[PDB]
Amino acid sequence: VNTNIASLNTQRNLNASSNDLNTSLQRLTTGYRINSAKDDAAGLQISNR
Amino acid sequence: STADGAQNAIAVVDNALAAIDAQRADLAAVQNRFKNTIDNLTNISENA
Amino acid sequence: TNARSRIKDTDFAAETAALSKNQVLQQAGTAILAQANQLPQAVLSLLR
Amino acid sequence: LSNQISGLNVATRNANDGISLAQTAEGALQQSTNILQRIRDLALQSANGSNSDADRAALQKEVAAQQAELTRISDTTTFGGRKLLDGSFGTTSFQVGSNAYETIDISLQNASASAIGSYQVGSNGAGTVASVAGTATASGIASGTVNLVGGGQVKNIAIAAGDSAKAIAEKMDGAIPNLSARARTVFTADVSGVTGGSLNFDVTVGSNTVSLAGVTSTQDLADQLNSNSSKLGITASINDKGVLTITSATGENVKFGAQTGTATAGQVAVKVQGSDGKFEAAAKNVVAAGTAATTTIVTGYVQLNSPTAYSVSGTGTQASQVFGNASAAQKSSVASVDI
Amino acid sequence: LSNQISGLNVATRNANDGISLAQTAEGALQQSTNILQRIRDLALQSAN
Amino acid sequence: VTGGSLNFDVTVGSNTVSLAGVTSTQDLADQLNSNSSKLGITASINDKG
Amino acid sequence: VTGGSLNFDVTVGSNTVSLAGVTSTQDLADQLNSNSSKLGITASINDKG
């Protein structure tokens, strides 16, 4: 097994964890669990109203 | 200016933000669909 | 405003823990990568 | 021996191809699980407090986009242009031995799509219309020995003449594996004009009996129910429209007693909620000033959610008096799911 | 399989581009939502 | 469309619903977009209407 | 199949079971596949049912 390595699941999990980390960092630096972004559009409408 | 505006503008902004948040919810849908499809896509490419 | 706080402002008491978990998981992933990217090198250098 | 080793080597290679194909399918199924759990989040958030989230259209759009993404996950799995989990899968069988017809079968799912394999539904108005179960009537729930089918565990549920929807649900529950049964009686009311007097009638909800009096408008009966909320465990609701709405979490077969009023003309029409939905348009009164009216009781509906396959039948009235002329749990209806 | 994985990678990159586009759109729409907030503010101030 | 609505049935293979309130091009677009999930359609209105 | 169940006995060599609740092509398939191990047979439903 040398033309490729099956460890690319690690890259997949790393990308997923990095996106989750950016979301958590944004939520922390903004203080809003429901960010002004797309997340929880229903809660977004409730917050807007 | 005097009478109508004070309330007509509310009549505007209510449905205005309603439509804006409708578009924001459509964007939320397409982006969540994008996250799901890109995760599926990485997984199926890795299995392939 | 109490409703808006209940719906918007994060209860970060668990968000900090989630952030620490994400950080240690990322570091663990980099460690797994550093260990796994070295297996084919070893198997080729020792089998050849 | 050379024949044997060659056959075993090529069989090992075919099995490697097969296990890789199976991992592709497993990843597709994992993604469908993620989509379904996200749908569950959006559905329980879709509770909206039942009146608070004015963006119900955008929420249905969100759920519809998630459904379209699920149907796309069904596709795009073309491991060789032969998409596995959706469409028409040939139910292949990988040969793993050095002998003829020595193979290992696989029974991949037909589709992650609509009713083609989502949870089958046994409902009241499923076929055309619903009998006594889920509508008003005079006599009430009659006798019967409705037959149940599924998992080789046929069980003739005995439904006596008079059993409320709650009792019927509790009865059909249990024996049949992975089947559940809820009870629900949702009925509205609308008092008509009262010529010279009011409607002094009664309401027997199960054991206890209401002794209300002086009904001239829907609002009067509304207050009478809201006050009697202690005794009768059935919440009432009158919106700005004018249609008083009464719902029972349990599912008791509400009955309206005799109309011993003092008026001369008038009636109180009621409707009953259907199984799937589409609240009844055709009205029918339970009490009427003057001549005695018909359909004096109100019987709720039940719903038999079924994961894979669950058939039900009944001799004549028995089948109708539960789920009408259904005889099949078909029309899983995950596509038509609304929010 | 090579055709498939190449198509999957380019689809991944196109999906990332689409995610970025939709996120820019979401930022623009939340900005417009803040503008509508300020417009209702000034409108109810116009009661005066 | 004059003097009433053009309410019509939309039959697509197995699943079938019936739209109502048809009075303009955008009206269709919208309601079909609402029912696209059930009917299995892709209702897309372009910039040219 | 009308008015009742098609409960019937399944004899396979030595082991013998008696199926019940079968009312459709899918039903019999599922019930047989459930007991496929005991009977030592291969009950498989195809795409065409």
Author numbering:
A (entry chain e): 5 to 53
B (entry chain f): 393 to 440
C (entry chain e): 441 to 488
D (entry chain c): 54 to 392
E (entry chain f): 54 to 101
F (entry chain g), G (entry chain d): 247 to 295
What does the paper say about this structure?
We used the same method here to reconstruct the PAO1 flagellar filament to 5 Å resolution. Using the composite flagellin model, we built a model of the full PAO1 flagellar filament and then fit it into the density map. Due to not imposing helical symmetry on our reconstruction there, we observed an inherent curvature in the density map, arising from the supercoiling of the filaments, which was preserved in the refined model we built. Between conformations 1 and 2, domains D2 differ from each other by a displacement of about 4–6 Å and domains D3 differed by about 8–15 Å. One protofilament on the outer curve of the filament had all of its outer domains in a single conformation (gold protofilament). This unique protofilament constitutes a seam or discontinuity in the helical symmetry of the outer domains. The seam is generated by the two conformations 1 and 2 alternating along the 5-start helix. An outer domain in the PAO1 filament forms three interfaces. The conformational states adopted by the PAO1 B type flagellin result in the formation of a rigid flagellar filament structure with a seam on the outer curve of its supercoiled structure.
